[PDB]
Amino acid sequence: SYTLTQPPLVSVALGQKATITCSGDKLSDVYVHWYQQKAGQAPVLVIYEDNRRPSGIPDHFSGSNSGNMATLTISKAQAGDEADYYCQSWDGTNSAWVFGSGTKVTVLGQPNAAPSVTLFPPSSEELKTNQATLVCMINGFYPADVAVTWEADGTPITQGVKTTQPSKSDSKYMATSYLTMTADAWKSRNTFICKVTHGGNTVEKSLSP
Amino acid sequence: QVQLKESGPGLLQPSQTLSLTCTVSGISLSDYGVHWVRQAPGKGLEWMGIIGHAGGTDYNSNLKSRVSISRDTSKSQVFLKLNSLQQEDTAMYFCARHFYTYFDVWGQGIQVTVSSATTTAPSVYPLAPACNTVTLGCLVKGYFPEPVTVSWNSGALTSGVHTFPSVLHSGLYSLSSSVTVPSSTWPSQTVTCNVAHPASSTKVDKKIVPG
């Protein structure tokens, strides 16, 4: 049951060194390989056998494998280098190929912008169905990673929640979070809140029936 | 020259058995093995198995007892089968060449969804603000399958629009759209949104109004 540990995210301003690290038991015994993957596309072999390039790949990728850490270097990062990156290896113990947990390398190319939140109440038209859907819409933020929390009368609300993944609009990212529930379990409560976290900033919007 | 393509269905239910053919060209299967790998939405790449150049096979432990790989070397076809399906089998499926330890050439990928959902037309609901420019919205709730077109005043509202990605729970999809309008225009001029769902043959207009 071999598993390769990989840090999930790696921010880096354009033209800086990005380092992604892959861990294992005796990772230097076996060869490591790295694949780049851009949203909705097949992986591409960027590095193989620890520190080797296939033809066609840029010279600004560079790998190494010592101790128990494999590492993929991106020197002088660019907009087109941003992607999900995956390390990989073989293991004899049980004949199988094992993939790393993946490192989403984000290449920052503009100021980090705060989100604009809008929290909509349920519609009369929906409430006649005896249902209630709150819509917390998040706009104009960068980079593309937010964290949403819901809270009713000051007690964290998890169940019934679902959030879209981020998605690029014009120049910045956008996302929504929904809270689904019964029509009267909305009318009962005093106040609802969606908390949208981004960077080291929280933005809050209230909604009280 | 050396290319791999995936073919097969993109919509199954938790009963059926999946069947994907990976078609090779440029090279011969007689002297190359082919891997299969999948990837659940926003999750890691998982190796499922391999069928070598010799015809020997080798599968993953967590997949085993319900996964089969075979081929047809004349047509250069490589086959994959997953019986006993569920929601969490839904993923992008890739086929990739074996070359020593690494995977040098990959397919483009084929999305597959496992879902017992039937073609349901959405419920469109308006979204007026709850008490220098205003933003309104349309909630397309509970539909299947994708996609769903969302417009505003039949294309007359191009600027200020924002269509967000669809989200899914208990089978059906949900999706919302919005329009920032100059504060003066609304509500002196009306704003309707136009939702289309070609799968359910449904076109539904909905005026957004103060409450």
Numbering used by the authors:
A (entry chain L): 1 to 9, 11 to 95, 95A, 95B, 96 to 106, 106A, 107 to 166, 168, ...
B (entry chain H): 1 to 82, 82A, 82B, 82C, 83 to 128, 136 to 154, 156 to 157, 162 to 169, ...
Copy text from the publication:
The crystal structure of the hamster HL4E10 Fab resembles that of a typical Fab. The HL4E10 combining site is composed of a relatively flat central area (formed by ValL31, ThrH98, TrpL96, IleH50, HisH95, and PheH96), surrounded by more protruding residues (AspH31, TyrH32 of CDR H1; HisH53-AspH58 of CDR H2; AspL30, TyrL32 of CDR L1; ArgL53 of CDR L2; and TrpL91 and SerL95A of CDR L3). A number of aromatic residues, i.e. three tyrosines (TyrL32, TyrH32, TyrH97), one phenylalanine (PheH96), two tryptophans (TrpL91, TrpL96), and two histidines (HisH35, HisH95); and two aliphatic residues (ValL31, IleH50) render the center of the HL4E10 combining site rather hydrophobic in nature. The side chains of two residues, namely TyrL32 and TyrH97, rise significantly above the central plain of the combining site, but do not exhibit any significant differences when comparing both HL4E10 molecules in the asymmetric unit, suggesting that the HL4E10 combining site is mostly rigid and structurally optimized for ligand binding. The rigid arrangement of the HL4E10 CDR loops is maintained by an extensive network of hydrophobic stacking and CH-π interactions, and is further stabilized by H-bonds between different CDR loops, as well as between CDR loops and framework residues.
Binding of one of those antibodies, HL4E10, to epithelial γδ T cell surface-expressed JAML (Junctional Adhesion Molecule-Like) receptor leads to potent costimulation via phosphoinsositide-3-kinase recruitment, activation of Akt and MAP kinase pathways, and cytokine production, ultimately resulting in epithelial γδ T cell proliferation. The primary structure of HL4E10 is the first example of a hamster lambda light chain sequence, and its heavy chain sequence is only the second known complete hamster heavy chain sequence. The binding of HL4E10 to γδ T cell-expressed JAML induces potent costimulation and ultimately cell proliferation, suggesting that humanized HL4E10 derivatives, might be useful therapeutic tools for treatment of γδ T cell dysfunction-associated diseases, such as chronic non-healing wounds or cancer.
